[PDB]
Amino acid sequence: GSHSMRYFFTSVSRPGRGEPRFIAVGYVDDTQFVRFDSDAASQRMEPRAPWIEQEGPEYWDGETRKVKAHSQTHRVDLGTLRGYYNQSEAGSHTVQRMYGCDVGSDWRFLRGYHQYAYDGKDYIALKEDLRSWTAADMAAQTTKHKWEAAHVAEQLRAYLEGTCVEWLRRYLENGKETLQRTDAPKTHMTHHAVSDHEATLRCWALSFYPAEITLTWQRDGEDQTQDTELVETRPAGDGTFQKWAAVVVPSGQEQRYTCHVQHEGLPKPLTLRWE
């Protein structure tokens, strides 16, 4: 399994209603492990997975230190962006940032990210090379220049290839039961008659980890991609995900349709049928 640590930060200005809000969450694969929310009593980085709790005063203090410094930078960022777009002081705005790293199955550095958006649109993004930037517009280009000059990407490689990878692995090591598991999907199908001449056939995938899964319906071998209702993979709230694919069969045609489920935890992918 390939693994990833990503961190997500959201800053939203509240004109008149104080300091902006900064929410920070971190993730290893589909498991969230930490959080920070400006509007909280705490004002500390909190654990959100059992395996990080044990870490230590030092861990928790340093991450509180850093997340609060990130908080302040994103709210210096917010005013600068207002200037770069010479916007009102009355408007709310949202910046969002996401950085992290991916390791393959051998747990070595595979990919490094750092992207930044403003008002739900790309603003600037480090490229896979981890030295150059993709500046969306003129403003993102001023910013690009600034970071070119201060050699910020040189410092970025240090974190995403050293520390991010180092810690992700530590996190895999230390959260082994959660993080190195692969819960294979529990599949089954439903049949409810929509009418006299047609019926819904729904293929379920339940209690699985990681979220990556393909749920495909077929009729006589033909892909049914234009005719499948596919819901988005949702969380069950216990660290597993759920998903379903449905088709409306002309009655009598049930034995033509086959569901197909592919997930990291399934030795060979499943083909299911109503019979």
């Binding site: 959201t10 929410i23 969450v25 439903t190 339940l206 949702r234 969380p235 709230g237």
Partner: protein, 100 residues
């Protein structure tokens, strides 16, 4: 200003077996801005101890959140999600279907 409408899924954590404990989830995803209101309803009435996850977002910068509450399904009991966001001309209600 980008404004994206929330997709809503209200479901349970486990197969709804009447008389047994489960959780009623309402996952909103796909929205922008962050600001969203989501209530879980038991027979129209608004359920009050309702948690939600920590705000996170997808590749395309839209936001998602899971709201949830412990519940024991009945056959007569009706449950739902009421969601409200700048994109909705009125609060969206989606009923729970135990088979979805």
């Amino acid at each position: 200003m980008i404004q994206r409408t929330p997709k809503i899924q209200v479901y349970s954590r486990h197969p709804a077996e009447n008389g047994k404990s489960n959780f009623l989830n309402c996952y909103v995803s796909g929205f922008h801005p962050s600001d969203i209101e989501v209530d879980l309803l038991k027979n129209g009435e608004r359920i009050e101890k309702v948690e939600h996850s920590d705000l996170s977002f997808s590749k395309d910068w839209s936001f998602y959140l899971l709201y949830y509450t412990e519940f024991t399904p009945t056959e007569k009991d009706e449950y739902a999600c009421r969601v409200n966001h700048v994109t909705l001309s009125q609060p969206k209600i989606v009923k729970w279907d135990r088979d979805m």
